[PDB]
Amino acid sequence: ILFKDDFNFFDEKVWTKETHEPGWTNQELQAYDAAHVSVGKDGDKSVLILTAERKGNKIYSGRINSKGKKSFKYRKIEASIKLPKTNGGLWPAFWMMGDNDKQWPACGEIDIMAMGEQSGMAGDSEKQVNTAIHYGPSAAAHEQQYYKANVANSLQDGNYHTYSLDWDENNLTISIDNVKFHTFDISSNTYFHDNFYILFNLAVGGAFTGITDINKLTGLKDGQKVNMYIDWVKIL
Amino acid sequence: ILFKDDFNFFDEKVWTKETHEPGWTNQELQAYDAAHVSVGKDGDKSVLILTAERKGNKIYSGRINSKGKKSFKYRKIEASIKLPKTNGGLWPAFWMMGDNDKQWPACGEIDIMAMGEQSGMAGDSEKQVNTAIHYGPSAAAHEQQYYKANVANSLQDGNYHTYSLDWDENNLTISIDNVKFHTFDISSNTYFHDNFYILFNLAVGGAFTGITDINKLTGLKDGQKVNMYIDWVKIL
């Protein structure tokens, strides 16, 4: 291990909690605030908790990043994550962006795992996983590669699962519970050859989910709190 | 050349016109019918014409395929296509499926070119091209790869452009006016190693475009006709 966070506490030398108004990105419904990021117990475990909450028609959730604190290149990153049932608008994600001062998408983005896509709500919202890379010199010149597939068993089953990215000069390889899920070829792609930092978030609604109006949100009701739990993250 | 259709006439030994009700696939708005496929003049060219038409809140367009008539494996295929302005819900495509009796996606699908995607309408709808592969043993076990980016200049500029697919045991490579656009690795993808037939269509609305309600269609007014033109297709 080059780095491990077991989430016995929220380490401000490594992570920053984000604060944003509703609809900051992707027509998302949640506001992000510090109060919806916590470290606490889940049975015998000490875990990072990102909490989506609805209070009337207002939605709050959590997002963290390691920008300017922890970044790496050409290493394996793994996280153990327990995901909420996403059907009806939840959008959890484990991802990376270039540790530089370039605006997205020119910083590069690696979406290791996201769930909650519009199309999973034919198919099985509990099994449908999306991985992606985004790049290009501006929002006008955005390029994306995308893979979507259903794993064998629910990933939204009350258990922790391991999400991995293997990274070298040629390939980004995503694995789930140590089984290869997809490879992106970065051998000629100039955006994936510098330090990247880590993000975790629990978005609510947004274009990815197909829910961009609070009146269409079915997965979070008035007063409800739904959690995304990260037991640990390691860089080998 | 293995095969060329210059479209001096509609050759029923190669092509079939499709007939389908609105909403048959992808939440599309158009009905397909034989009347909206024709072969005709475009200046001094003889071309295949797919015509999208609105009559009140009814939408009609054209779609052909070569299933059971013309199929091939591991050859370059090229077509010269003039596209309408897609902004507001038109979805033209040039694509291929496996020439077998497996139901999509187990027959395999290569989307060589599509325009009209939702995000193109922060993007540039005249430049944004989508290419994709779909595969997997059933709809429940659907897998998809896609790539989206702009090319340099408008493809919706009143001129014909050449869309090319190179295909060997390792790679599917899409080119647009002889500039390589994207490569999919199929070396270990068992769905892209048998005969495929050819399709052309002009869809109106559908999930891809983000318009699935005629009340959100802006690209086809009541009484309007728009054409997609194919001057030729060839297999080398």
Per-residue three-class SS string for A161-230: EEEEEEECCCEEEEEECCEEEEEEECCCCCCCCCCEEEEEEEEECEHHHCECCHHHCCCCCCCCEEEEEE
Q: How far off is chain B from A63, nearest CA to CA, in Å? A: 24
Which 3-state string (H, E, C) describes chain A? CCEEECCCCCCCCCCEECCECCCCCCCCCCEECHHHEEEEEECCEEEEEEEEEEECCEEEECEEECCCCCEECCCCEEEEEECCCCCCCEEEEEEEEECCCCCCCCCCEEEEEECCCHHHCCCCCCCEEEEEEEECCCCCCCEEEEEEEECCCCCCCCCCEEEEEEECCCEEEEEECCEEEEEEECCCCCCCCCCEEEEEEEEECEHHHCECCHHHCCCCCCCCEEEEEEEEEEEC
Q: Phi and psi at residue A104, in whole multiples of 5°?
A: -55, 140
Q: Is A207 within 8 Å of B144 when comparing Cβ atoms?
A: no
Size of interface A-B (CB pairs under 8 A): 51
Q: Which residues contact B34 (CB under 8 A, 6 or more apart)?
A: B17, B19, B62
Q: How far off is chain B from A144, nearest CA to CA, in Å? A: 6
Determine the residue type at B228: M
Q: Phi and psi at residue A13, in whole multiples of 5°?
A: -80, -15
> Does the bond joining A105 to the residue before it have cis omega, within 30 degrees of 0?
yes
B207 contacts on A by Cβ (under 8 Å): 118-119
Q: Is B123 within 8 Å of A144 when comparing Cβ atoms?
A: no
Q: Which residues contact A215 (CB under 8 A, 6 or more apart)?
A: none
Supply the DSSP symbol for B220. Answer: S
Mutate to test the interface with B, among A27, A131, A142 (most CBs of B within 10 A): A142
Determine the Cα–Cα distance for residues B104 and B96; give it in Å rounded to an integer.
Answer: 11
Supply the Cα-derived Rg of chain A in whole angstroms. 17
Q: Please, which experimental method was used?
A: X-ray
Q: Which residues contact A222 (CB under 8 A, 6 or more apart)?
A: A54, A55, A56
Q: How far off is chain A from B41, nearest CA to CA, in Å? A: 36
Q: Is A146 within 8 Å of B144 when comparing Cβ atoms?
A: yes
Burial of residue B43, with CB atoms counted within 10 A of its CB: 0-12 exposed, 13-18 middle, 19 or more buried: exposed
Q: Which of A132, A122, A116, A176 is nearest to A152 (CA)?
A: A176
Determine the Cα–Cα distance for residues B36 and B59; give it in Å rounded to an integer.
Answer: 11
Nearest CB partner across the interface for B148, out of A122, A124, A143? A143
Q: Pick left, alpha or beta for residue A57 (phi over 0 → left; psi -120 to 50 → alpha; otherwise beta).
A: alpha
B118 contacts on A by Cβ (under 8 Å): 207
Strands A45-55 and A225-235: antiparallel
Dump the DSSP string for B33-44.
-GGGEEEEEETT
3-state secondary structure of B186: coil
Report the alpha-carbon angle A121-A207-B57, nearest 5: 80
Q: Under a CB-based contact definition with an 8 Å cutoff, are residues A70 and A3 in contact?
A: yes
Q: How far off is chain B from A224, nearest CA to CA, in Å? A: 30
In chain B, the DSSP E strands lie at 3-5, 16-17, 31-32, 37-42, 45-55, 58-61, 63-65, 71-72, 77-82, 90-98, 109-114, 128-135, 143-150, 161-167, 171-176, 179-185, 196-204, 225-235
A185 contacts on B by Cβ (under 8 Å): 183, 185
Q: Under a CB-based contact definition with an 8 Å cutoff, are residues B23 and B13 in contact?
A: no
Q: Is B149 within 8 Å of A136 when comparing Cβ atoms?
A: yes
Q: Going from the N-terminus, what domains does chain B have, and what CATH number goes with each?
A: 3-235 (2.60.120.200)
Strands B31-32 and B58-61: parallel
B150 contacts on A by Cβ (under 8 Å): 141
Determine the Cα–Cα distance for residues A76 and A236; give it in Å rounded to an integer.
Answer: 5
Q: Which of A40, A16, A5, A66 is nearest to A225 (CA)?
A: A40
Residue count of chain A: 236
Supply the Cα-derived Rg of chain B in whole angstroms. 17
Determine the Cα–Cα distance for residues B120 and B114; give it in Å rounded to an integer.
Answer: 11
| CA distances to A215, B189, B224 from A56, in Å | 11, 48, 45
